[PDB]
Amino acid sequence: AVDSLLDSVKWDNKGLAVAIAQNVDTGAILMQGFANREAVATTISSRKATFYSRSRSSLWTKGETSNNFINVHDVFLDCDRDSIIYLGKPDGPTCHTGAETCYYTPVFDLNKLALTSLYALESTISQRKAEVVPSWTKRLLLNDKLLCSKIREEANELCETLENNEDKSRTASEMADVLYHAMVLLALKDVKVEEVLQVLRQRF
Amino acid sequence: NAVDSLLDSVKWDNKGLAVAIAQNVDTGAILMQGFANREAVATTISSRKATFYSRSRSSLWTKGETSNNFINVHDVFLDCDRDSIIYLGKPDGPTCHTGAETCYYTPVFDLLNKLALTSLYALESTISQRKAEVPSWTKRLLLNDKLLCSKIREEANELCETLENNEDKSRTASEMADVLYHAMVLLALKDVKVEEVLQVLRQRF
Ligand SMILES: Nc1ncnc2c1ncn2[C@@H]1O[C@H](COP(=O)(O)O)[C@@H](O)[C@H]1O
Ligand SMILES: Nc1ncnc2c1ncn2[C@@H]1O[C@H](COP(=O)(O)O)[C@@H](O)[C@H]1O
Ligand SMILES: Nc1ncnc2c1ncn2[C@@H]1O[C@H](COP(=O)(O)O)[C@@H](O)[C@H]1O
Ligand SMILES: [Mg+2]
Ligand SMILES: [Zn+2]
Ligand SMILES: [Zn+2]
Ligand SMILES: [Zn+2]
Ligand SMILES: [Zn+2]
Ligand SMILES: [Zn+2]
Ligand SMILES: [Zn+2]
Structure with a gap:
């Protein structure tokens, strides 16, 4: 065969x-x-x-x-x-x-890896964490209470796009709001997005 | 020129x-x-x-x-x-x-037509199949807005507690997956592709 x-x-x-x-x-x-x-x-x-x-x-x-x-x-x-x-x-x-x-030889930046949108943002958040130890990521990395409240509140706003029948672009915009702040928490806890996606795959 | x-x-x-x-x-x-x-x-x-x-x-x-x-x-x-x-x-x-x-849509192990998908977009495709076929947890979430939203808020809570209570990184990873899944059921309800969300992120650079 x-x-x-x-x-x-x-x-x-x-x-x-x-x-x-x-x-x-x-x-x-x-x-x-x-x-x-x-x-x-x-x-x-x-x-x-x-x-x-x-x-x-x-x-x-x-x-x-x-x-x-x-x-x-x-x-x-x-x-x-x-x-x-x-x-x-x-x-x-x-x-x-x-x-x-x-792949780490960029032609337009004329050594950084080739990253798609989600993994480039994770890389940016990682750079702020390193320069931590005026940026909004550095402000979140340096304030646990503010970050967690932001994640809980943005998750609330994402649901309200469903609950209150907001436009699809509103849902996407709030999902991006949830995604960014969660990845700042991911960076604090030393978790790569790939590890999270591995968990999803293991639940198939 | 350069x-x-x-x-x-x-x-x-x-x-x-x-x-x-x-x-x-x-x-x-x-x-x-x-x-x-x-x-x-x-x-x-x-x-x-x-x-x-x-x-x-x-x-x-x-x-x-x-x-x-x-x-x-x-x-x-x-x-x-x-x-x-x-x-x-x-x-x-x-x-x-x-x-x-x-x-790329010719799987070789299925020959021994589905697109080649990585994990996140394969889950998106599965959630999409459950939406069209509407005994599965996804179909139940798609049929109860109040339940789906309650699970999102609850799971977002659990993710924060892994930071707040100094839980292990594996716990954060596991809870982040929980948030992602239930959020994508909401995305499927609002007809939102993950790519559309990532375009928004890229536009905020
Ligand atoms: N990604 C790669 N692409 C091309 N050649 C590689 C790569 N990785 C390793 N090699 C070379 O292929 C041989 C096998 O090495 P490895 O498979 O890495 O143990 C060695 O000669 C390596 O230098
Ligand atoms: N709590 C969960 N976290 C992550 N993925 C999940 C979860 N529950 C269900 N899934 C995914 O949804 C798929 C279909 O589940 P079901 O709708 O129950 O048939 C599973 O194979 C998993 O990939
Ligand atoms: N409120 C936000 N929502 C979504 N992405 C954000 C937000 N703030 C910052 N980012 C992302 O984080 C990157 C760096 O932001 P900053 O740490 O504020 O310099 C930006 O280029 C965006 O990709
Ligand atoms: Mg609102
Ligand atoms: Zn090489
Ligand atoms: Zn080569
Ligand atoms: Zn928001
Ligand atoms: Zn072709
Ligand atoms: Zn060809
Ligand atoms: Zn959970």
Whole structure:
């Protein structure tokens, strides 16, 4: 059944397809390599992301020496079946330099990681926490009583958009209000958003 | 120029291409993966529209040039070895030519059609299925506004108590998940996508 599936992949002249490893919990692109028929099959059977190293001319499972495996949860093919997503959860940092992902060379800021909207805000909140030990985040990080009251009150306002039939944009605006203040509490308690999303996934 | 010096450091392959991945700036969903040469990257930067090189037609191709479903690029990233590119952008419409939101919807373990979703947006999709099928806790919350809102306020209370009562970080993590779930049932009631919420956060930068 695996044989019938690998035959459908559109490989290039070298027998390769693009294989992208993505964090199953956050969506961050960890790394992008290449896979041949055997590299994808090994990923399927071993549940650890495996690629074809063109340089070393051999199969390569991420973590085989460093133990920073990418435990693969699902594999996706795009429409033309020439691109692959390894959707996995990494044991440690993915890049061989030690960086969390391989993408940290911004072209517009001309070393910061590539972050989507939710994880960039978490990163900003983290920077305020470091400069703590005039900012609204620093004010919340330095006042537990104010932060907790703000979370309770904003949660109240989110519900009032449902209870009082406010516009959908009002609900989104208040959900953002809840999300920001909760992440300031997350930072105080040393909790990453990824850990929270892992909890959600474990409750499936 | 500074961009020219940046394109010069890019390690292009023998035919002058590099892998280009389009990713949703707000959610992280991978929209599509193509290939870019210097001019596809340079034009992507200048026009702020994701532009690739169509190898089959052997010409430049801007995603959306016919369908108007452009990918409006917010950032461009190079990986460590500088042979892989991420166009980080916000798409006008569905990216795949079939109409799918993204191009990646062929699960391999289900073959041994669902979109590839990460945890937060998979929970959003599940809550959405419960809303349409309306013995499940989500359907019950969708059928009782007073109960749903009571649970949100109660769970937001519990999250604060983990800070107030010096509870363990695992307790904070567990309670934050509780707040997130019940909030997303309220989002589904008000027809709010998580992406819409994250756009608001991004707009408050
Ligand atoms: N994310 C990565 N992308 C490309 N090459 C890598 C990556 N991580 C490690 N390597 C290299 O691949 C080999 C396997 O290392 P590792 O899988 O990290 O134990 C070593 O030569 C590493 O330097
Ligand atoms: N208290 C909770 N915290 C987080 N996720 C939850 C919770 N209750 C239900 N879920 C999620 O909702 C899904 C469907 O639940 P149900 O509507 O009871 O079938 C589960 O598989 C979980 O992912
Ligand atoms: N009231 C707020 N609601 C939502 N996001 C906020 C709020 N205040 C600050 N932020 C976020 O926190 C970042 C840093 O704010 P500050 O710590 O006040 O400099 C902003 O760029 C926003 O992304
Ligand atoms: Mg109000
Ligand atoms: Zn393709
Ligand atoms: Zn790397
Ligand atoms: Zn508010
Ligand atoms: Zn690379
Ligand atoms: Zn497509
Ligand atoms: Zn709880």
